[PDB]
Nucleic acid binder design. Structure first.
Length: 1190
DNA sequence: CTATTAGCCTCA
């Protein structure tokens, strides 16, 4: 063997095969994106290819070209530069597809001709083939080695000294030797897995430090054979084939486990059937474990209280990012007094658990009759959760709720889980360049497990290693993006926020205790894909329905377009036309006389009754016949009659047609031994109809994936090409997802003359035909379900409901009602009924029909006639398709055209409903967020972040009141309106948020526009306009379809618009303004100082003459607090745009006029006239005079 | 107080 890299010197890198029209479509947008964006950037190419035209071949050609380019590039640099190789992947969901793709790639490597001459020599082929690895699961991995290989590994490492390992190997080898029956293979697989778990563990244990066994010669080859992932690390190979489940786990090498998700720079991924990966990623997310919310609190509070005294090298600036966590923990623990245990006070009220659910933004649903509160009792020394007094009023509780405690515990846990990523990132930052203690090169992936293990070690929290690994990376990838906070100043969405679920059931072990379980979902598959693209990976997805219009059975492409932007590449019209021309050229139906017939059939009762009476003539009634001989009950009569009649009519219609040989009837249930009576009835009918004509028919029942893997699909192939007749196959929609390629060999002797080829050019390979008659039934339940545990199904259902609400297919009222009904127990029937009223159902049904139709037919030998039978319930759904028919299959368009001819149909646009629902949701979220922020601002001391948030919101609303383009950062402050610049609404901003009406539905409601806020009259002032120009505020409203929500037009805009006006007017007459000293924030406008006078004057401003229900003790409390904290002082109450003809009242602490000398509050009616835009010098003159000795 | 079920890969 002389396989070396240097061999490729004498080989021309200029001859290429003929570029197909399907090839430039992949290379051109990539080049455009490279020249527009940077060299190191991500992308996403949803390629809508079609079955039977070639999708795997093009991807394999692309992979081969990339490998050749890498090999070419590696030779040039040689010595002047050393780095790693590019990584390339091929990921799917099925093992058979993986092995078939690898075999096809290898075969393509062997055989390839340019101008009738082999492209590569034998040594070149060997070198290329020595670069691809395949990584199956561990248990199957152990069953491909040999005795000599594993013996060599054991002897080289000096492991043939313990009797246990050798005994286990001998037992496994013997059991493998004698293993033919199907009930011992499971034990063999389990034993192989458990042996592989310990072996690689020992190999890593020995060599992760001293006494490193050198690898060379044949021992290196043996270790590489046993560990395919070892070849990648050293640099031997840089191409991998694996499944999606393995991709999210990683593969082992001699040092540790390498996770592909954690190092994706300069990598290329190829995923086929990309739309189906949504459910796989959802299952992987939902398979997570739960966690009791009070055991970890105790462990974290007790084991982190005090530590030892040892800094040591390596560690540097790790404790600095942990002190705030302890500060928060102590503050949280010294409020509820969590040291005490938990109990409940109720008179036999623990039969059933109180579930608690939350969305973390604006949705909160509980299944308790009355709200529960938490209290601390100093008598019994225990914390209790109780409903307290049931009497009306009597000092109703307002301190807090259990939901608040749950949310606080959850946010504490999330913050703890999140700080470790930054700590480890800083640790690798100092290690890499700031330490250089050991010469190892490597990246974050190399020194990852050691750091987390050591830290779990330093603070000893080992029982948390599994909890922290799931959500560990360099930065994010599983939690939020951008601002990394759930605030109004950052982009908000469900796809990177998640949900929460908490249950309170009875606690066993100790009867006088309660438990609090929790399940989490930190992200959604769309967010995961977005993070993968952002990290710097080029993703290329191949599928035929990659851009479906559903969020249950597909990715949410509306969210990806608002986060990626220019990195989501799309094709133009010319490229689609070229693809369309290629597909017609390769499959031409407007020639050779190929025709399709489509027929919708209904249900009949005389037909079935006559057939039943002919079946058993000894009986008197059909009801007795069905109740006695068949297994159906009294309830199941109409449904069985309908579907059986439809199937029998379709079968009879097919049998009547002479020139046909194949039939596949897609159904929704499997026809097995459980339905033997119905099978016998169908067989009798088939025999009768075969006798009526002159044909021989053979029927196949119970065709499952198990039947495919036990008997095989080749039985039909032999039966079709040896004996003349007709074949009928019974199967299911889901069954034809694991068994592919339903073809068979042809025979010109047995077949007639109707085998016309459809391709316009000569066709290579063998001769094969496909199905020429199919029966389609209306699909049933399309709500995803999980059968792993009890919590996974509930998590899936809540995720589906939240996604449906977020997309815009559900109003907040309907979503809340559905969540409440599901939380407290629901049946599948009610869930399906609720789901049937949306617009996603029709899209899902249409996608299912298109996928089912497309998979039938992969050859060029089509019969003269093809018959299609469709259920009568699909007419309305298939009659409402209005996309463009450019990439449609030749049979789906026929269905649409036939269904559309049934009269004229009224179609209601989804847009109007989407805009209405989104406006409602935005208004509700704004209301709740503003209320929460205002409540937070009133708890002294006020945080710095809250003040920054408030100021940024006010400044953004002042500067830009109408944005032309869709905002990205300040997202949920605007709503899209049909009219530009103004809109109408109707609601009360004191009650139920989901009771608002918008736009055309109310023509006599309140108005939000520029003419209502009185902007022009204010702007005309000569003392205010220069201020507005200096600060850059808007002097007029632009005309675009993005306006602020009604909540922001009344409680935010008016106040600022008045405040700046009064400040600008008053600042000229020797007045200065300051900021509130953080103690009474939001209770007053500014602080006023002038001429160095005692008792500093506070200012309060309002925009217009607003009367509110504030005559209660709120004003007295405010004035008392100000007087206590600052002594005697003076206060100014100012309005704007009123009447400059009303005198000035002198007020005491209350609003009753008193003596001018003994006065503290000034009520100034107005300063700027609303008629000619004048001002009021007399008012300010009297103001200045009043500040004197009086 | 309505609709009407089959398939899957990985590891503690």
């Amino acid at each position: 063997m002389n396989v070396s890299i240097e061999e490729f010197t004498h080989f021309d890198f200029q001859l290429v095969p003929e570029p197909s029209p399907l090839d430039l479509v992949i290379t051109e947008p990539l080049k455009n994106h490279i020249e527009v964006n940077g060299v190191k950037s991500g992308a996403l190419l949803p390629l809508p290819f079609q079955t039977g035209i070639g999708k795997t071949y093009t991807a394999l050609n692309f992979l081969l070209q990339q490998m050749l380019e890498q090999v070419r590039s590696e030779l040039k640099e040689e010595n002047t530069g050393k780095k790693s190789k590019r990584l390339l992947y091929y990921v799917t969901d099925s093992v058979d597809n993986v092995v078939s793709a690898k075999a096809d790639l290898l075969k393509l490597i062997e055989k390839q001709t340019v101008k009738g001459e082999p492209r590569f020599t034998l040594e070149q082929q060997e070198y290329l083939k020595a670069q691809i690895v395949h990584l199956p699961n561990q248990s199957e991995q152990l069953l491909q080695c040999s005795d000599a290989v594993l013996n060599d590994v054991l002897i080289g490492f000096n492991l043939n000294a313990e009797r246990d390992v050798q005994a286990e190997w001998s037992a496994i080898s013997g059991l493998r030797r004698h293993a033919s029956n199907p009930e011992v293979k499971i034990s063999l697989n389990r034993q192989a897995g458990y042996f592989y778990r310990n072996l690689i563990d020992r190999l890593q244990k020995k060599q992760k430090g001293a006494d490193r066994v050198l690898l060379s010669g044949s021992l290196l080859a043996s270790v590489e054979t046993l560990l395919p992932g070892e070849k990648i690390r050293n640099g031997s190979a840089h191409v991998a084939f694996l499944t999606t489940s393995k991709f999210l786990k990683g593969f082992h090498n001699t040092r540790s486990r390498y996770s592909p998700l954690r190092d994706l720079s300069g990598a290329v991924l190829i995923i086929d059937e990309i739309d189906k990966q949504n459910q796989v990623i959802l299952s992987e997310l939902c398979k997570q474990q739960a966690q009791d919310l009070i055991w970890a609190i105790r462990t974290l509070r007790a084991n982190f209280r005090d530590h030892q005294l040892e800094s040591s090298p390596r560690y540097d600036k790790i404790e600095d990012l942990f002190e705030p966590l302890r500060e928060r923990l102590e503050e949280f623990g010294t409020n509820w007094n969590l040291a005490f245990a938990f109990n409940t006070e109720g008179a036999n009220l623990n039969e059933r658990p109180v579930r608690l659910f939350s969305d973390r933004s604006f949705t909160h649903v509980s299944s308790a009759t009355h709200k529960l509160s938490l209290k601390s009792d100093f008598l019994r020394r225990k914390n209790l959760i109780f409903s307290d007094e049931k009497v009306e009023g009597s000092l109703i509780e307002k301190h807090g709720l259990l939901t608040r405690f749950v949310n606080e515990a959850d946010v504490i846990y999330q913050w703890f889980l999140g700080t470790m990523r930054k700590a480890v990132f800083q640790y690798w930052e100092n290690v890499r360049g700031l330490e250089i203690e050991v010469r190892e090169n490597r990246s974050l992936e190399g020194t990852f497990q050691e750091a987390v293990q050591s830290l779990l070690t330093h603070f000893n929290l080992q029982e948390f290693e599994s909890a922290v690994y799931e959500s560990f990376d360099t930065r994010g990838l599983r939690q939020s993006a951008g601002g990394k906070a759930n605030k109004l100043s950052s982009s908000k969405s469900y796809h990177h926020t998640g949900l929460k679920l908490v249950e309170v059931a009875h606690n066993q072990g100790t009867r006088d205790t309660v438990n609090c379980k929790a399940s989490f979902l930190n992200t959604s598959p769309s967010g995961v894909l977005a993070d993968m693209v952002d990290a710097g990976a080029v993703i290329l997805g191949i599928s035929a329905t990659a851009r479906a219009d559903t969020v249950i059975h597909n990715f949410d492409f509306k969210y990806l377009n608002e986060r990626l932007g220019n990195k989501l590449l799309s094709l133009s019209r010319e490229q689609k036309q070229r693809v369309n021309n290629y597909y017609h050229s390769r499959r031409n139906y407007k020639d050779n006389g190929v025709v399709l017939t489509v027929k919708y059939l209904n249900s009949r009762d005389a037909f079935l009754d006559a057939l039943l009476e002919e079946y058993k003539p000894e009986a008197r009634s059909s009801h007795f016949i069905l109740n006695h001989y068949l297994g159906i009950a009294e309830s199941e009569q109409a449904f069985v009659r309908s579907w059986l009649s439809k199937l029998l009519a379709s079968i009879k219609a097919f049998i009547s047609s002479p020139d046909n040989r194949y039939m596949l009837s897609l159904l929704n249930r499997t026809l097995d031994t459980t339905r033997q009576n119905i099978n016998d009835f169908i067989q009798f009918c088939c025999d009768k109809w075969a006798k009526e004509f002159n044909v021989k028919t053979k029927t196949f029942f119970g065709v499952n994936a198990d039947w495919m893997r036990l008997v095989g699909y080749d039985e039909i192939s032999k039966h079709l090409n040896t004996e003349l007749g007709k074949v009928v196959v019974f199967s299911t929609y889901a069954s034809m997802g694991a068994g592919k390629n339903p073809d068979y060999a042809v025979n010109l002797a047995l077949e007639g003359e109707s085998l016309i080829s459809v391709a316009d050019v000569t066709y290579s390979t063998q001769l094969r035909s496909d199905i020429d008659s199919i029966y389609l039934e209306k699909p049933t339940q399309l709500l995803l379900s999980d059968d792993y545990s009890h919590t996974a199904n509930q998590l899936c259902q809540f995720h589906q409901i939240l996604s449906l609400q977020e997309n815009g297919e559900l109003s907040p009222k309907s979503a809340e009602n559905w969540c409440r009904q599901q939380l407290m127990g629901m049946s599948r029937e009610r869930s399906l009924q609720q789901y049937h009223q949306t617009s996603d159902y029709q899209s899902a049904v249409r996608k299912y029909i298109e996928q089912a139709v497309g998979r039938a037919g992969r050859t060029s030998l089509k019969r003269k006639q093809i018959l299609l039978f469709v259920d009568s319930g699909l007419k309305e759904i298939l009659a409402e398709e209005s996309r463009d028919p450019s990439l449609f299959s030749h049979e789906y368009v026929a269905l649409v055209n036939k269904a559309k001819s049934a009269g004229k149909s009224i179609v209601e646009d989804r847009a109007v409903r989407r805009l209405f629902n989104l406006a409602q949701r935005n208004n509700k979220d704004g209301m709740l967020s503003i209320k929460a922020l205002v409540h937070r601002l009133h708890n002294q001391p006020a945080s710095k972040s809250d003040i920054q948030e408030w100021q940024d919101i006010r400044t953004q609303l002042l500067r830009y009141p109408t944005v032309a383009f869709q905002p990205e950062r300040f997202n949920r402050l605007y709503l899209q309106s049909m009219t530009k610049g103004y809109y109408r609404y109707q609601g009360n901003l004191d009650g139920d948020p989901n009771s608002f009406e918008f736009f055309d539905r109310v023509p006599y409601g309140d108005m939000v526009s520029e003419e209502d806020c009185s902007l022009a009259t204010l702007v005309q002032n000569q003392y205010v306009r220069p201020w507005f120009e200096r600060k850059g505020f808007a002097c007029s409203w632009q005309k675009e379809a993005n306006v602020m929500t009604p909540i922001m037009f009344t409680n935010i805009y008016k106040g600022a618009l008045g405040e700046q006006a009064v400040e600008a007017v008053l600042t000229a007459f020797d007045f200065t303004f300051e900021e509130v000293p953080n103690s009474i924030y939001e209770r007053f406008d500014n602080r006023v100082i002038f001429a160095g006078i005692e008792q500093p004057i506070w200012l309060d401003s309002k925009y217009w003459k607003h009367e509110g229900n504030e005559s209660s003790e709120g004003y007295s409390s405010k004035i008392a607090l100000v007087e206590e904290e600052f002594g005697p002082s003076k206060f100014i109450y100012v309005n704007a745009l009123g009447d400059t003809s009303k005198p000035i009242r002198y007020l005491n602490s209350c609003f009753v006029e008193t003596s001018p000398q003994l006065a503290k509050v000034i009520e100034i009616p107005a300063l700027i006239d609303d008629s000619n835009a004048d001002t009021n010098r007399t008012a300010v003159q009297e103001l200045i005079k009043w500040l004197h000795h009086s």
